[PDB]
Design an enzyme around this catalytic site. Structure first.
Site, short mmCIF file in Angstrom:
data_model
loop_
_atom_site.label_atom_id
_atom_site.label_comp_id
_atom_site.label_asym_id
_atom_site.label_seq_id
_atom_site.Cartn_x
_atom_site.Cartn_y
_atom_site.Cartn_z
N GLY A 99 0.83 -1.22 0.00
CA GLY A 99 0.00 0.00 0.00
C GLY A 99 0.86 1.26 0.00
CB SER A 100 -0.24 4.61 0.69
OG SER A 100 -1.69 4.67 0.24
CB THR A 101 3.81 1.95 3.90
OG1 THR A 101 3.57 0.70 3.26
CG2 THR A 101 2.85 2.08 5.05
CG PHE A 102 6.04 0.90 -2.26
CD1 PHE A 102 5.94 1.39 -3.55
CD2 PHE A 102 6.92 -0.14 -2.03
CE1 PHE A 102 6.75 0.90 -4.56
CE2 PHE A 102 7.72 -0.63 -3.05
CZ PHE A 102 7.65 -0.10 -4.31
CE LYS A 103 -0.13 6.79 -2.46
NZ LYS A 103 -1.19 7.83 -2.43
#
Length: 510
Positions: A229-233
């Site tokens: 998920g967006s932890t990876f942005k």
């Protein structure tokens, strides 16, 4: 003797103990050539006295004592693994035929405790030989075992801190109460070293008892892959900040983007129109990440996701560490990657990456094994340390990345204020994300079929610890799950860890 697994403070996590096993000689034949009888005589009155001290009924004690063509009977699970005074009681009863045979058993003092890291050793009834079956125990079986004078095995020191590892095991319990997820994990890691201070998952097993051993064979941290998920942005944003595609005050068009004819859109579907890139991230605009991918260019963004050490094992000391894969087969995989779908990661891969924002660009290779040393010879067979896995970004980049993470949580427009803590300044990134369908399929469906994560660190800017927490497919309060996410686990775990590490603010949390 087999080695001990210790914590970082040499508190025992696993050791050998001598325990005892009940045996009754039921058949007369033992005392044809003996003064004192060597066989049970009052099968009712010996059965009575043995009760209370054993967790069996005086009914069933006789039931097992009145078996025939049998010289020497035992009592299953219930009359094995018995303590030293447990013996002194039965020994004082001076019962005939009754003997206590000493069997050595592997002992896990805190029971269900880092159960998936430490693992478990199983005993061969015949030789009484203990063999490691998962986790540290299996990894280092050779070193721990004294078979590979009766010689003692070698000790193994973990970077685990029993006192933190507590706060974690407690909070994780609290989540299986509230959300009964299909999968869950937390990990604490020293921001400045890559030492794993605590780590647990659910479901797990109790290595003392052997309860639920098997089931989930896989360690979350090292072996299980996730669409993060967006932890990876955060890593996309870094790359862009480096390449110069990002500027917090520059505007871009939020709403949706049409990619291989698919309307991937911000979480409100509409967007907020033309807004500054800063707010976009603070908001978690998926369009932003796709915009930045376009500006930087597919080829460079793969090179960047590789440079953050994804789709390549961290080379930590766990059995079959998973590498995961970068989703870059077609242009959709690539855009969905930007906000942490398609691409699969080990949570450790994430810890590695996130470290670079606090270690002035350098990713720290995460490690949990401090040393392997025979406690007789004192010879350090292996010794762990902080190495650098890479420096994908500069100090400048990192500092900027950090400010945006500060805002995610501490902006007036924060959609992540539920991750805040009284008496400590927190920062990090949130990650609500759909889950892949186990066998073939595509995406697990449901009301909120998500993997919520948070990748925070405190105190903000110059942090002591990183906490990564992930919850998969909450089968209860599945709404609250979407809304609060892993805030209910993170807040305790961090707060207590910071107190325990003696960091201060405005009250000194006395």
């Amino acid at each position: 003797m087999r080695g001990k697994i210790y914590d970082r403070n040499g508190k025992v996590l696993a050791e050998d103990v001598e325990r005892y096993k009940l045996v009754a000689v039921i058949d007369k034949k033992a005392s044809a050539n003996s003064k004192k009888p060597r066989h049970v005589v009052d099968k009712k009155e010996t059965a009575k006295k043995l009760s209370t001290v054993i967790n069996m009924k005086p009914e069933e004690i006789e039931k097992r004592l009145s078996q025939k063509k049998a010289f020497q009977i035992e009592f299953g699970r219930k009359g094995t693994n018995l303590t030293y005074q447990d013996k002194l009681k039965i020994e004082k009863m001076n019962l005939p035929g009754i003997s206590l045979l000493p069997e050595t058993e592997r002992f896990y003092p805190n029971g269900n405790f880092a159960s998936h890291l430490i693992g478990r050793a199983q005993k061969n009834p015949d030789t009484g030989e203990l063999k490691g079956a998962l986790g540290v125990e299996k990894i280092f079986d050779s070193y721990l075992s004294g078979s590979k004078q009766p010689k003692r095995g070698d000790d193994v020191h973990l970077t685990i801190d029993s006192n933190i590892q507590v706060f974690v095991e407690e909070a994780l319990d609290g989540m299986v109460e509230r959300y009964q997820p299909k999968d869950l994990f937390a990990v604490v890691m020293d921001a400045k070293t890559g030492e794993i201070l605590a780590y647990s998952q659910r479901p797990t097993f109790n290595p003392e008892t052997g309860k639920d051993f098997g089931k989930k064979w896989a360690n979350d941290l090292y072996q299980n892959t996730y669409e993060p998920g967006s932890t990876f942005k955060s890593y996309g944003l870094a790359a862009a900040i480096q390449e110069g595609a990002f500027d917090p005050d520059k505007k871009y068009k939020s709403g949706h983007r049409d990619i291989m004819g698919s309307r991937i859109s911000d979480w409100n579907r509409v967007g907020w129109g033309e807004i500054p890139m800063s707010l976009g991230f603070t908001y978690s605009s998926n369009t932003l990440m796709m915009h930045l991918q376009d500006l930087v260019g597919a080829d460079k963004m793969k090179s960047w996701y590789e440079r953050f050490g994804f789709g390549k094992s961290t080379k930590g000391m766990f059995d079959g560490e998973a590498p995961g894969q970068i989703g870059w087969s077609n242009e959709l995989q690539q855009k969905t990657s930007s906000f942490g779908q398609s691409t699969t990661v080990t949570p450790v891969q994430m810890l590695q990456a996130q470290s670079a924002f606090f270690n002035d660009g350098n990713m720290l290779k995460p490690w949990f094994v401090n040393s392997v040393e025979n406690p007789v010879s004192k010879r350090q067979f292996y010794k762990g340390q902080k190495q650098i896995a890479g420096k994908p970004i500069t100090k400048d980049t990192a500092e900027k990345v950090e400010k945006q993470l500060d805002l995610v949580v501490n902006s007036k427009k924060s959609h992540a204020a539920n991750y805040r803590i009284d008496g400590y300044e927190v920062e990090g990134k949130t990650g609500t994300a759909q889950v892949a369908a186990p066998n073939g399929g595509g995406y697990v469906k449901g009301p909120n079929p998500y993997f919520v994560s948070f990748m925070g660190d405190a105190p903000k800017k110059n942090p002591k610890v990183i906490v990564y927490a992930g919850m998969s497919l909450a089968q209860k309060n599945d709404q609250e799950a979407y809304e609060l996410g892993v805030s209910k686990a993170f807040k305790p775990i961090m707060e207590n860890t910071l107190k325990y590490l003696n960091v201060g603010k405005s009250k000194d949390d006395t």
